[PDB]
Amino acid sequence: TYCVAMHLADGLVFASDSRTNAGIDHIATFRKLFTFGTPGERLLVVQTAGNLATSQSVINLLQQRIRRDGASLLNVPSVYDATALVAETTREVMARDSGNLAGNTDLSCSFMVGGQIAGGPPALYSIYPQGNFIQATPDTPFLQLGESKYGKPILDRNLTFDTPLEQALRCALVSFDSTIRSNLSVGMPLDLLVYHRDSLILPEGYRVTEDDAYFSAIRRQWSAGLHDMLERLPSPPSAYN
Amino acid sequence: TYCVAMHLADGLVFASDSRTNAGIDHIATFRKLFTFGTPGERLLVVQTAGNLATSQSVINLLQQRIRRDGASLLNVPSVYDATALVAETTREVMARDSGNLAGNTDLSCSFMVGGQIAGGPPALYSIYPQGNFIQATPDTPFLQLGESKYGKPILDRNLTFDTPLEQALRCALVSFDSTIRSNLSVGMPLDLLVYHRDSLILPEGYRVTEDDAYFSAIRRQWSAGLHDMLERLPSPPSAYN
Amino acid sequence: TYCVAMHLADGLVFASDSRTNAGIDHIATFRKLFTFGTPGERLLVVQTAGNLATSQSVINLLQQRIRRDGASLLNVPSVYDATALVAETTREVMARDSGNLAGNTDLSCSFMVGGQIAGGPPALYSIYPQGNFIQATPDTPFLQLGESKYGKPILDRNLTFDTPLEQALRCALVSFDSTIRSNLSVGMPLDLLVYHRDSLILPEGYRVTEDDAYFSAIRRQWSAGLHDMLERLPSPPSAYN
């Protein structure tokens, strides 16, 4: 479980893995990036991390309620209020499943909610286990969920509010490369989605499998590059021994 | 106790054993696959694993309540809500039987709930000992309960969302074959049910006994096959000694 | 101001005029038939009669509240409860505008509320100035508001629960014909809406202007008919002089 989302000058970029702890000795693939919207009016993306049961219930309820007269991700007036609604829904799910039977088992999960609603700029939020959330800004334009320390440095080094989408995406992919190599809880397939500021369309998004020609290639290149750079760095002086 | 359920493009397939630990020196046969519904409107299947007393009580209450004005498996608006109702019911049973008298004895059990209600696609959920649940998806289209590691590999290898029903069933049967050979807690008769997407009928389902011609045959074939493949595999090179 | 609504075996038919007393020397056109709903789930129609300021405020609040988390015409579980909500809203409006400044001026108005919500039959209610309401039934299948005595006889004579919609509508139009000829407070354009039982769609409804070919024609025909029948009725006997 590792998710990243970026809010940049030109729009939004989302990327999630799929490897999921579904119980003991049951590791499995589950999508962690979901889209919602009406074309020409709004796009919203929700990413998930943490307890599967909880996050599934949350997503499921959001879907059921879309087709119902009352508060829903399709009528909510701002990306803020969408984020709040997700949080609200999370609280509701935690209330029900909590009891003596759950015991000390940890039901918490976290989300990212981003997108654009007609008539206001695109936005991106991250909801914490405890249900309070923060918004990405130009000074802090990307947010992560899950197992994210491994792939943070490359984003810290290169990403800024002005990074174009194609390059941000690329950057995200390298982030996943390092993460996958160094932590087995993270794993392919990946799910990506790129959204263009003010387009107000629902992009289809894309799934990166094991076999993906492009992702295989940039991994091979990135390795060769790192290995090169390392050999062509100077040796430590006398002093260092 | 071993149960499997699959949610595929063409519908659902369920299979359960029947061997049940009912106390010390009392191992016995109990059905672990139950059906509910109204023809032309809905089919719901519940499978059970874990403590007999608890699961029996849950099933029994669901049956009694079907014939009563209020929340029941027949009026519940979605497969999700059915799953939630089963869980709700489980909580209720655990609350009552818990006390000093039970002591440290382990009353927990798990369930699968799957089926289709008119006006929405078929679905399949698994409820954990603790009462929270997950949904099967195209990427993870089968779920298991009970003593399931023995027969997992064959499902991992062959089964996908697009596998047709007849082949999925066959696959399940091989799963049971290996399981039964390698673990005595699992045992015949088996109970199967296949449901066709959008049919909205209550299939009668089928019980596989010790004597079943077909199942006996495919077991004999599968053995012969494995034995053959093994002898016709190449020898390890020099290097390996 | 004259409104009629009918609840018949095959559905509902609504018709309202538009001529409105909006102050001294200010007679004007205002729509007196409003629709609400979500396609495939519900249709509700509200007709108005009486004080313009009051009725406008009521309708305006019902619209504003539709787009808000709380009681509204879109979430209300039955046509009964919709009617109650309209009444509830009316009370609220009367409470606020009442004071010394209004004085003895008459702020009352009346409404009809009819339609269908998924899962129950269509229904039709009339709310009185005082806020209590009645329901139309098979024995009394039409209800009127405003200046209605002129056009009542034709409805009494011909309309019944089993009258088909096209004929009921026609009947309503003749009701308006007579009313318009005999009372200036009532006037075109008219606004009609026909709803088919169990359709659960929002009909667009139709406006009948001064120029309407069909309405002009049936008025001309109806005149000629009446004039004929009158001349071909027999003479009073000797006795009558």
XYZ file of C-alpha atoms in Angstrom:
723
model
C 0.000 0.000 0.000
C 1.564 3.221 -1.225
C -0.343 6.130 -2.754
C 0.791 9.513 -4.034
C -1.141 12.505 -5.276
C 0.114 15.803 -6.626
C -1.576 19.101 -7.146
C 0.318 21.134 -9.679
C -0.111 24.264 -11.746
C -1.426 22.268 -14.731
C -3.658 19.837 -12.806
C -3.573 16.671 -10.719
C -1.715 13.390 -10.884
C -2.660 10.320 -8.852
C -0.891 6.987 -8.440
C -1.536 3.980 -6.231
C -0.224 0.421 -5.861
C -2.583 -2.510 -5.289
C -0.955 -4.910 -2.877
C -3.138 -5.258 0.146
C -2.978 -6.959 3.471
C -6.300 -8.712 3.649
C -5.708 -10.831 6.718
C -3.037 -13.218 7.866
C -1.431 -15.202 5.087
C -3.815 -13.489 2.672
C -2.080 -10.797 0.677
C -3.982 -9.746 -2.415
C -4.612 -7.254 -5.169
C -7.223 -4.480 -4.612
C -7.675 -1.223 -6.514
C -6.832 1.804 -4.341
C -7.816 4.605 -6.713
C -11.459 5.353 -7.485
C -13.010 8.030 -9.702
C -16.361 9.780 -9.607
C -18.018 12.565 -11.558
C -20.256 13.985 -14.239
C -18.540 15.037 -17.515
C -18.308 18.815 -18.041
C -19.152 19.420 -14.364
C -16.805 17.528 -11.980
C -14.073 14.980 -11.407
C -13.260 13.507 -8.002
C -10.672 10.886 -7.151
C -10.419 8.973 -3.908
C -7.400 6.917 -2.897
C -7.315 4.522 0.018
C -4.852 3.111 2.470
C -5.095 1.202 5.748
C -7.668 -1.354 6.748
C -9.293 -2.978 3.735
C -12.657 -3.701 5.353
C -13.058 -0.163 6.477
C -11.932 1.518 3.296
C -14.058 -0.805 1.163
C -17.119 -0.040 3.225
C -16.479 3.653 2.875
C -16.097 3.508 -0.890
C -19.071 1.235 -1.224
C -21.331 3.595 0.689
C -20.154 6.567 -1.344
C -21.113 4.663 -4.511
C -24.528 3.537 -3.236
C -25.329 7.093 -2.077
C -24.403 8.705 -5.400
C -27.628 7.139 -6.764
C -29.782 8.686 -3.958
C -31.417 12.081 -3.121
C -29.193 13.530 -0.355
C -25.536 14.343 0.340
C -23.245 12.626 -2.170
C -19.987 13.097 -3.998
C -21.961 14.329 -7.052
C -23.832 17.257 -5.485
C -21.369 18.424 -2.829
C -20.418 22.017 -3.738
C -16.613 21.929 -3.324
C -13.644 19.518 -3.176
C -13.328 20.528 0.466
C -16.915 19.385 1.179
C -16.218 16.164 -0.730
C -13.274 15.480 1.552
C -15.429 16.249 4.550
C -18.107 13.862 3.262
C -15.586 11.057 2.896
C -14.429 11.692 6.463
C -17.997 11.859 7.682
C -18.648 8.501 6.005
C -15.537 6.996 7.550
C -16.746 7.984 11.050
C -20.025 6.278 10.319
C -18.329 3.023 9.319
C -16.033 2.998 12.395
C -18.997 3.527 14.692
C -20.820 0.447 13.387
C -17.917 -2.107 13.265
C -16.509 -1.083 16.660
C -17.667 -3.397 19.534
C -16.279 -6.135 21.854
C -15.987 -8.523 18.865
C -13.421 -6.388 16.982
C -11.433 -6.200 20.275
C -7.977 -4.583 19.844
C -7.761 -5.090 16.061
C -6.885 -1.833 14.208
C -9.694 -0.662 11.904
C -8.288 2.702 10.862
C -7.647 3.952 7.388
C -6.663 7.031 5.475
C -7.669 8.593 2.192
C -6.792 11.187 -0.399
C -9.515 13.139 -2.069
C -8.740 15.380 -5.000
C -10.289 16.757 -8.141
C -12.148 19.733 -9.557
C -15.693 20.988 -9.466
C -16.936 23.450 -12.081
C -16.299 27.037 -11.064
C -13.390 26.597 -8.751
C -9.788 25.505 -9.057
C -8.627 21.898 -8.638
C -7.719 20.807 -5.101
C -6.204 17.883 -3.180
C -6.688 16.769 0.417
C -5.387 13.977 2.625
C -7.503 12.523 5.443
C -5.726 11.064 8.426
C -6.663 8.002 10.458
C -8.345 10.257 12.984
C -10.630 11.955 10.408
C -9.108 15.431 10.233
C -7.534 16.514 6.987
C -5.054 18.724 5.220
C -4.826 20.390 1.877
C -1.922 20.370 -0.496
C -0.546 23.782 -1.469
C 2.077 25.214 -3.807
C 4.745 24.985 -1.049
C 3.703 21.342 -0.277
C 2.250 20.097 -3.555
C 2.336 16.359 -3.039
C 0.932 14.050 -0.398
C 1.467 10.373 0.322
C -0.305 7.515 2.019
C 0.875 4.181 3.162
C 4.423 3.055 3.031
C 5.875 6.294 1.697
C 9.301 7.036 3.215
C 11.139 4.909 0.622
C 9.986 6.993 -2.321
C 9.796 10.379 -0.650
C 13.289 11.641 -1.402
C 12.937 11.622 -5.166
C 9.747 13.699 -4.831
C 11.254 16.091 -2.334
C 14.248 16.626 -4.648
C 12.496 17.186 -7.969
C 8.826 17.961 -7.581
C 7.419 21.489 -7.319
C 4.108 23.208 -8.007
C 5.338 24.155 -11.485
C 6.507 20.651 -12.522
C 4.516 19.678 -15.665
C 2.190 16.681 -15.437
C 4.113 14.277 -17.729
C 7.245 14.875 -15.575
C 5.421 14.586 -12.280
C 3.993 11.285 -13.390
C 7.408 10.073 -14.370
C 8.680 11.165 -11.021
C 5.933 9.244 -9.267
C 6.850 6.139 -11.184
C 10.435 6.297 -9.998
C 9.123 6.728 -6.489
C 7.243 3.412 -6.921
C 10.282 1.762 -8.425
C 12.396 2.366 -5.285
C 9.534 1.538 -2.960
C 8.764 -1.788 -4.648
C 12.382 -2.850 -4.490
C 12.768 -2.084 -0.852
C 9.428 -3.103 0.672
C 7.383 -6.191 -0.164
C 4.129 -4.803 1.236
C 4.048 -2.596 -1.881
C 3.386 -4.158 -5.253
C 2.037 -4.043 -8.760
C -0.238 -3.515 -10.602
C -0.290 0.251 -10.220
C -3.165 2.500 -11.102
C -2.537 6.015 -12.498
C -4.697 8.952 -13.346
C -3.755 12.312 -14.792
C -6.260 15.212 -14.823
C -5.848 18.461 -16.729
C -6.789 21.722 -14.946
C -10.174 23.011 -16.168
C -10.766 20.079 -18.520
C -13.708 18.821 -16.377
C -13.578 15.368 -18.059
C -13.233 11.953 -16.421
C -9.937 10.534 -17.651
C -9.936 6.781 -18.061
C -6.711 6.394 -16.121
C -4.239 3.590 -16.759
C -3.030 0.401 -15.157
C 0.643 -0.491 -15.037
C 1.233 -4.229 -14.973
C 4.304 -6.348 -14.427
C 4.593 -6.504 -18.244
C 4.378 -2.807 -19.018
C 6.952 -1.953 -21.690
C 7.416 1.679 -20.658
C 7.674 1.111 -16.899
C 10.060 -1.841 -17.427
C 12.231 0.394 -19.576
C 12.520 3.332 -17.266
C 13.329 1.008 -14.376
C 16.180 -0.553 -16.375
C 17.415 2.935 -17.367
C 17.176 4.359 -13.896
C 19.261 1.431 -12.571
C 21.943 1.883 -15.179
C 21.949 5.611 -14.484
C 22.372 5.276 -10.717
C 25.054 2.655 -11.132
C 26.947 4.978 -13.528
C 26.752 8.023 -11.314
C 27.954 6.101 -8.379
C 31.098 4.833 -10.138
C 31.879 8.248 -11.505
C 31.638 9.966 -8.101
C 34.996 10.730 -6.603
C 36.694 8.642 -3.912
C 36.775 9.858 -0.293
C 40.059 11.595 0.586
C 42.815 10.123 2.793
C 41.218 11.734 5.866
C 38.141 9.398 5.813
C 39.879 6.164 7.037
C -14.242 -26.884 7.267
C -13.201 -25.340 3.988
C -15.349 -23.015 1.879
C -14.710 -21.208 -1.414
C -16.724 -18.691 -3.316
C -16.025 -17.031 -6.617
C -17.458 -13.987 -8.278
C -16.868 -14.124 -11.989
C -17.971 -12.376 -15.130
C -20.751 -14.965 -15.737
C -21.964 -15.310 -12.128
C -21.136 -16.948 -8.832
C -19.890 -20.322 -7.750
C -19.987 -21.595 -4.189
C -18.543 -24.734 -2.618
C -18.281 -25.965 0.951
C -17.300 -29.143 2.780
C -19.319 -30.458 5.725
C -16.954 -31.916 8.257
C -17.373 -30.085 11.501
C -15.781 -30.081 14.878
C -18.763 -30.298 17.180
C -16.942 -30.968 20.461
C -14.322 -33.414 21.665
C -14.553 -36.842 20.032
C -17.604 -35.583 18.151
C -16.739 -34.809 14.566
C -19.801 -34.626 12.376
C -21.484 -33.590 9.182
C -23.185 -30.166 8.988
C -24.206 -28.219 5.904
C -22.143 -25.038 5.523
C -23.924 -23.502 2.523
C -27.380 -22.000 2.833
C -29.565 -20.322 0.244
C -32.278 -17.676 0.566
C -34.431 -15.740 -1.894
C -37.569 -15.096 -3.883
C -37.588 -16.347 -7.518
C -37.322 -13.576 -10.129
C -36.210 -11.066 -7.463
C -33.179 -12.307 -5.458
C -30.727 -15.063 -4.575
C -28.490 -14.944 -1.505
C -26.070 -17.577 -0.324
C -24.441 -17.735 3.085
C -21.489 -19.982 3.890
C -20.199 -20.639 7.367
C -16.920 -21.509 9.044
C -15.763 -21.496 12.630
C -17.700 -22.242 15.776
C -20.720 -24.418 15.114
C -22.911 -23.080 17.920
C -22.366 -19.523 16.855
C -22.852 -20.025 13.178
C -25.923 -22.145 13.735
C -27.457 -19.493 15.899
C -26.766 -16.841 13.292
C -28.315 -18.862 10.490
C -31.261 -19.815 12.632
C -32.076 -16.217 13.496
C -31.810 -15.151 9.868
C -34.346 -17.849 8.982
C -36.773 -16.983 11.782
C -36.590 -13.292 10.898
C -37.278 -13.835 7.178
C -40.854 -14.638 8.263
C -41.189 -11.324 10.207
C -41.953 -7.629 9.447
C -38.570 -5.868 9.817
C -34.953 -6.164 8.580
C -34.362 -9.550 6.901
C -32.431 -11.146 4.094
C -35.509 -10.877 1.863
C -36.129 -7.101 2.012
C -32.593 -5.781 2.420
C -31.956 -3.562 -0.659
C -28.434 -4.796 -1.670
C -25.987 -7.666 -1.261
C -23.832 -5.224 0.762
C -26.696 -4.645 3.209
C -27.317 -8.380 3.404
C -23.676 -8.900 4.417
C -24.046 -6.119 6.967
C -27.159 -7.755 8.346
C -25.396 -11.109 8.756
C -22.580 -9.324 10.608
C -25.063 -7.380 12.718
C -26.677 -10.716 13.606
C -23.352 -12.276 14.485
C -22.609 -9.446 16.941
C -25.956 -10.023 18.570
C -25.234 -13.749 19.066
C -21.746 -13.122 20.515
C -23.124 -10.617 23.001
C -25.617 -13.128 24.458
C -23.389 -16.288 24.777
C -20.395 -14.381 26.178
C -20.157 -14.570 30.008
C -18.035 -16.232 32.745
C -19.478 -19.653 31.807
C -18.034 -19.661 28.271
C -14.660 -18.708 29.859
C -11.739 -18.827 27.366
C -13.502 -21.044 24.778
C -13.371 -19.527 21.244
C -16.850 -18.608 19.919
C -15.830 -16.819 16.743
C -16.908 -17.622 13.218
C -16.722 -16.288 9.723
C -19.100 -16.158 6.779
C -19.379 -15.521 3.087
C -22.393 -13.768 1.724
C -22.943 -13.596 -2.003
C -25.713 -13.400 -4.562
C -27.761 -10.994 -6.613
C -30.691 -8.712 -6.002
C -32.855 -7.461 -8.865
C -31.518 -4.267 -10.386
C -27.868 -4.570 -9.460
C -24.974 -6.817 -10.353
C -24.084 -9.987 -8.431
C -21.632 -9.577 -5.540
C -19.631 -11.582 -2.990
C -18.400 -10.634 0.495
C -16.444 -12.329 3.253
C -17.027 -11.485 6.916
C -14.162 -11.896 9.314
C -14.254 -13.221 12.874
C -14.292 -9.622 14.108
C -17.389 -8.609 12.043
C -15.846 -6.357 9.395
C -16.004 -7.507 5.778
C -14.531 -7.348 2.342
C -15.768 -7.634 -1.159
C -14.381 -9.753 -3.932
C -13.364 -7.843 -7.079
C -12.106 -8.683 -10.579
C -8.502 -8.520 -9.358
C -9.314 -10.772 -6.367
C -12.272 -12.804 -7.586
C -12.279 -15.676 -5.094
C -12.424 -15.870 -1.323
C -11.864 -18.753 1.105
C -12.840 -19.706 4.611
C -11.575 -22.309 6.911
C -8.664 -24.553 6.163
C -7.763 -23.020 2.805
C -3.977 -22.928 2.289
C -3.856 -26.484 0.896
C -6.137 -25.703 -2.026
C -5.160 -22.114 -2.658
C -2.392 -22.638 -5.198
C -4.561 -24.230 -7.827
C -6.954 -21.273 -7.580
C -4.198 -18.709 -7.646
C -2.744 -20.359 -10.766
C -5.840 -20.746 -12.896
C -8.735 -18.689 -11.698
C -9.498 -15.191 -12.970
C -12.571 -12.987 -13.248
C -13.125 -14.216 -16.832
C -12.939 -17.943 -16.038
C -16.284 -19.503 -17.100
C -18.442 -21.055 -14.399
C -18.104 -24.756 -15.433
C -14.291 -24.345 -15.291
C -14.258 -22.450 -12.062
C -16.342 -25.190 -10.470
C -13.977 -27.809 -11.752
C -11.129 -25.815 -10.364
C -12.815 -25.646 -6.985
C -13.269 -29.396 -6.964
C -9.567 -29.957 -7.499
C -8.950 -27.532 -4.653
C -11.062 -29.785 -2.421
C -9.336 -32.872 -3.682
C -5.920 -31.702 -2.470
C -7.336 -30.320 0.732
C -9.116 -33.541 1.664
C -6.018 -35.609 1.076
C -3.793 -33.449 3.186
C -6.051 -32.411 6.088
C -8.525 -34.603 7.928
C -10.501 -31.706 9.384
C -11.914 -31.256 5.863
C -14.287 -33.870 4.503
C -17.201 -34.927 2.368
C -19.983 -34.550 1.522
C -19.506 -31.268 -0.323
C -22.225 -28.842 -1.211
C -22.040 -26.816 -4.441
C -24.066 -24.089 -5.986
C -23.666 -22.338 -9.311
C -25.596 -19.133 -10.080
C -25.889 -17.476 -13.464
C -25.562 -13.653 -13.655
C -28.981 -12.006 -14.076
C -30.918 -15.339 -13.920
C -32.526 -14.371 -10.564
C -33.512 -17.995 -9.900
C -32.728 -20.147 -6.869
C -30.565 -22.993 -8.130
C -31.122 -26.252 -6.321
C -27.425 -26.784 -5.821
C -25.826 -30.215 -5.634
C -24.271 -32.470 -3.053
C -21.148 -34.428 -3.791
C -20.943 -37.663 -1.812
C -18.219 -40.226 -1.300
C -19.822 -42.203 -4.133
C -20.055 -39.460 -6.720
C -19.057 -40.915 -10.092
C -17.818 -37.640 -11.588
C -15.823 -36.464 -8.624
C -14.283 -39.913 -8.172
C -13.241 -39.879 -11.794
C -11.609 -36.495 -11.917
C -9.696 -37.350 -8.736
C -8.362 -40.539 -10.325
C -7.462 -38.610 -13.505
C -5.824 -35.776 -11.702
C -3.654 -38.257 -9.789
C -2.581 -40.091 -12.872
C -1.859 -36.787 -14.572
C 0.316 -35.425 -11.790
C 2.191 -38.679 -11.496
C 2.815 -38.709 -15.267
C 4.046 -35.059 -15.437
C 6.368 -35.698 -12.593
C 8.082 -38.662 -14.248
C 8.362 -36.862 -17.545
C 10.036 -33.741 -16.011
C 13.770 -33.526 -16.711
C 16.525 -34.454 -14.288
C 18.449 -31.744 -12.438
C 21.827 -30.974 -14.012
C 25.213 -32.052 -12.597
C 25.482 -28.765 -10.682
C 22.662 -29.659 -8.224
C 24.531 -32.364 -6.124
C -56.815 31.937 -10.118
C -58.395 28.557 -10.732
C -56.639 25.202 -10.308
C -57.823 21.625 -10.769
C -56.170 18.319 -10.065
C -57.438 14.811 -10.658
C -56.306 11.474 -9.354
C -57.519 8.729 -11.648
C -56.951 5.072 -12.217
C -54.307 5.773 -14.893
C -52.504 8.638 -13.125
C -52.742 12.338 -12.380
C -53.805 15.393 -14.342
C -53.085 18.948 -13.222
C -54.199 22.270 -14.653
C -53.853 25.863 -13.489
C -54.523 29.347 -14.860
C -52.035 32.172 -14.366
C -53.953 35.363 -13.793
C -53.018 36.782 -10.469
C -54.070 39.707 -8.340
C -50.731 41.231 -7.381
C -51.979 44.494 -5.901
C -54.303 47.254 -6.991
C -54.238 47.966 -10.727
C -51.566 45.268 -11.009
C -53.040 42.102 -12.404
C -50.397 39.835 -13.776
C -49.292 36.475 -14.981
C -47.692 34.050 -12.487
C -47.207 30.300 -12.881
C -49.339 28.353 -10.400
C -48.082 24.848 -11.111
C -44.641 23.733 -10.045
C -42.925 20.354 -10.483
C -40.213 18.644 -8.466
C -38.507 15.276 -8.567
C -35.734 12.868 -9.486
C -36.310 10.752 -12.668
C -37.040 7.068 -11.970
C -37.698 7.820 -8.281
C -40.362 10.560 -7.806
C -42.601 13.244 -9.252
C -44.315 15.897 -7.120
C -46.503 18.740 -8.317
C -47.541 21.750 -6.258
C -50.306 24.118 -7.285
C -50.995 27.438 -5.587
C -53.932 29.731 -4.982
C -54.489 32.709 -2.695
C -52.031 35.380 -1.562
C -49.173 35.796 -4.022
C -46.564 36.869 -1.468
C -47.278 33.964 0.779
C -47.406 31.326 -1.891
C -44.279 32.624 -3.500
C -42.418 32.504 -0.261
C -43.551 28.953 0.343
C -42.463 27.761 -3.105
C -39.202 29.633 -2.864
C -38.312 27.996 0.456
C -39.192 24.535 -0.855
C -36.822 25.110 -3.784
C -33.948 26.472 -1.655
C -34.297 23.567 0.798
C -34.213 20.902 -1.935
C -30.515 21.746 -2.306
C -29.849 21.249 1.498
C -29.243 18.351 3.944
C -32.555 18.073 5.874
C -36.298 17.689 5.245
C -37.153 18.506 1.609
C -39.536 17.508 -1.151
C -36.857 15.171 -2.550
C -36.259 12.946 0.496
C -39.670 12.919 2.148
C -40.840 9.284 2.142
C -44.486 9.700 0.901
C -46.816 12.076 -0.917
C -48.604 12.465 2.402
C -45.403 13.665 4.081
C -44.730 15.988 1.139
C -48.127 17.570 1.669
C -47.366 17.866 5.371
C -44.067 19.524 4.565
C -45.697 22.086 2.333
C -48.172 22.836 5.121
C -45.378 22.989 7.694
C -43.604 25.470 5.430
C -46.753 27.582 5.008
C -47.090 27.882 8.816
C -43.528 29.067 9.006
C -44.133 31.797 6.410
C -47.342 33.020 8.082
C -45.579 33.267 11.441
C -42.857 35.588 10.091
C -45.001 38.047 7.987
C -47.715 38.392 10.630
C -47.321 41.554 12.782
C -48.965 44.981 13.316
C -47.727 46.127 9.875
C -49.718 43.540 7.911
C -52.784 44.643 9.964
C -56.067 43.114 8.672
C -54.760 42.223 5.186
C -55.449 38.554 4.282
C -52.255 36.494 3.898
C -53.773 33.054 3.507
C -53.282 30.661 0.639
C -54.072 27.134 -0.380
C -52.211 24.446 -2.259
C -52.551 21.098 -4.002
C -49.809 18.571 -3.714
C -49.879 15.450 -5.829
C -47.575 12.945 -7.414
C -45.897 9.587 -6.925
C -42.924 8.321 -5.013
C -41.282 4.995 -5.925
C -42.900 2.103 -4.143
C -46.321 3.479 -3.483
C -49.305 4.525 -5.570
C -49.835 8.045 -6.865
C -51.766 10.411 -4.562
C -53.304 13.898 -4.482
C -53.974 16.225 -1.555
C -55.455 19.685 -1.096
C -54.254 21.962 1.710
C -56.725 24.480 3.088
C -56.040 28.063 4.180
C -55.827 26.857 7.771
C -53.127 24.207 7.057
C -55.078 20.986 7.401
C -55.526 18.821 4.302
C -57.567 16.222 2.528
C -56.867 13.451 0.108
C -58.681 12.753 -3.150
C -60.212 9.286 -3.433
C -62.022 7.203 -6.039
C -65.401 8.578 -4.875
C -64.071 12.175 -4.964
C -61.323 12.036 -7.562
C -60.889 15.717 -8.359
C -60.129 18.786 -6.277
C -60.204 22.498 -7.053
C -58.656 25.702 -5.810
C -59.524 29.290 -6.419
C -62.503 30.429 -8.375
C -63.937 26.979 -9.044
C -67.765 27.040 -8.917
C -68.090 28.090 -12.574
C -66.339 25.000 -13.901
C -67.442 22.476 -11.297
C -70.569 21.174 -12.933
C -68.902 19.768 -16.022
C -66.493 17.836 -13.751
C -69.211 16.624 -11.455
C -71.203 15.368 -14.441
C -68.516 13.545 -16.382
C -65.444 12.824 -14.343
C -64.909 9.596 -12.410
C -61.961 7.607 -11.105
C -61.997 5.481 -14.247
C -62.033 8.387 -16.755
C -58.882 8.053 -18.936
C -56.268 10.790 -18.771
C -56.734 12.258 -22.300
C -60.506 12.624 -21.525
C -60.005 14.038 -18.074
C -57.667 16.649 -19.492
C -60.214 17.526 -22.117
C -62.803 17.803 -19.422
C -60.548 20.145 -17.425
C -60.105 22.347 -20.473
C -63.857 22.761 -20.866
C -64.002 23.639 -17.169
C -61.527 26.461 -17.863
C -63.426 27.581 -20.939
C -66.593 28.264 -18.965
C -64.657 29.800 -16.078
C -62.740 32.199 -18.274
C -65.902 33.377 -20.001
C -67.735 34.066 -16.800
C -65.044 35.445 -14.463
C -62.275 37.877 -15.364
C -60.095 37.017 -12.382
C -59.292 33.789 -14.243
C -57.173 33.939 -17.354
C -54.661 32.484 -19.745
C -52.034 31.202 -20.189
C -52.844 27.863 -18.622
C -50.303 25.317 -17.448
C -51.036 21.586 -17.716
C -49.319 18.467 -16.653
C -50.272 14.837 -17.189
C -48.535 12.047 -15.266
C -48.845 8.333 -16.006
C -49.223 5.939 -13.041
C -45.923 4.156 -12.280
C -43.972 6.002 -15.015
C -41.828 7.824 -12.411
C -40.706 10.403 -15.040
C -40.980 14.201 -14.878
C -43.291 15.204 -17.704
C -42.422 18.515 -19.277
C -45.988 19.746 -19.028
C -47.479 22.181 -21.498
C -48.564 25.790 -21.649
C -51.790 26.806 -23.347
C -51.652 30.293 -24.738
C -54.246 32.601 -26.258
C -53.100 31.312 -29.685
C -53.313 27.595 -29.028
C -54.836 25.903 -32.079
C -56.311 22.949 -30.195
C -57.817 24.880 -27.334
C -59.245 27.501 -29.699
C -60.870 24.696 -31.688
C -62.521 22.853 -28.873
C -63.910 26.134 -27.523
C -65.469 26.926 -30.928
C -66.857 23.369 -31.119
C -68.183 23.344 -27.616
C -70.043 26.628 -28.326
C -71.616 25.294 -31.479
C -72.542 22.107 -29.642
C -74.263 23.865 -26.740
C -76.102 26.186 -29.087
C -77.375 23.167 -31.086
C -78.525 21.147 -28.073
C -80.335 24.145 -26.729
C -82.396 24.699 -29.901
C -83.200 21.011 -30.182
C -84.486 20.712 -26.574
C -88.242 20.563 -26.381
C -90.606 23.438 -25.553
C -92.248 23.656 -22.106
C -95.802 22.190 -22.042
C -99.048 24.259 -21.855
C -98.961 24.026 -18.037
C -95.873 26.316 -17.689
C -97.539 29.707 -18.569
